[PDB]
Amino acid sequence: DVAGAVIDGAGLGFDVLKTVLEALGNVKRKIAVGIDNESGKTWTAMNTYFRSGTSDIVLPHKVAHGKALLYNGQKNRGPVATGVVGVIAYSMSDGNTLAVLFSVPYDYNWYSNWWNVRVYKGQKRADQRMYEELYYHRSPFRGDNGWHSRGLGYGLKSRGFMNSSGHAILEIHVTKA
Numbered sequence: 033d034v035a036g037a038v039i040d041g042a043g044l045g046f047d048v049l050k051t052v053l054e055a056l057g058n059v060k061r062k063i064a065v066g067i068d069n070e071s072g073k074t075w076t077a078m079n080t081y082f083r084s085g086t087s088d089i090v091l092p093h094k095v096a097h098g099k100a101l102l103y104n105g106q107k108n109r110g111p112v113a114t115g116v117v118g119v120i121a122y123s124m125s126d127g128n129t130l131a132v133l134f135s136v137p138y139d140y141n142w143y144s145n146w147w148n149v150r151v152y153k154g155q156k157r158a159d160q161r162m163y164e165e166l167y168y169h170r171s172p173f174r175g176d177n178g179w180h181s182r183g184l185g186y187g188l189k190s191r192g193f194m195n196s197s198g199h200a201i202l203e204i205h206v207t208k209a
């Protein structure tokens with residue numbers, strides 16, 4: 033149960049994600065991400081785009097059906113009042129791309145946690161343009177301590193949960209629709 037590993041999909045839960053958060057140590061803004069692949073396709077890591085922040089973890093390179101990937105991110109170290117915000121992209125064996133936005137801000141007086149999930153047609157790397165699409169145009173979900181579901185198209189659907197604080201857990205399940 034370390035970031036950068038894959039685990040059995042059924043093993044993914046908030047406990048595993050707190051373990052991942054705990055291993056980052058007591059930094060101010062951090063995220064543990066778990067994505068359960070029940071899509072019937074194999075996923076291959078493409079890249080992570082960071083608007084702000086960093087990860088020392090290599091995306092789990094291959095995520096088979098029935099496995100969950102674990103990942104993390106943290107704010108840039110030092111006296112910078114910024115959070116951790118980015119987009120993960122995995123290529124799926126059907127030729128399309130699974131994209132996941134996460135956004136954990138610095139200042140909770142003014143901003144909140146958000147996430148999103150989308151399938152793109154073709155093989156599309158995560159980048160600033162994708163961040164802008166997922167954040168400003170494709171109806172992101174609040175990290176509001178509740179579950180949110182949506183159909184993804186392509187025979188898939190998503191269900192996920194993110195909490196509201198600056199030590200964020202993001203648990204996502206991708207299933208057949």
Ligand SMILES: [Cl-]
Pocket residue numbers: 142143144145
């Ligand atoms: Cl906000």
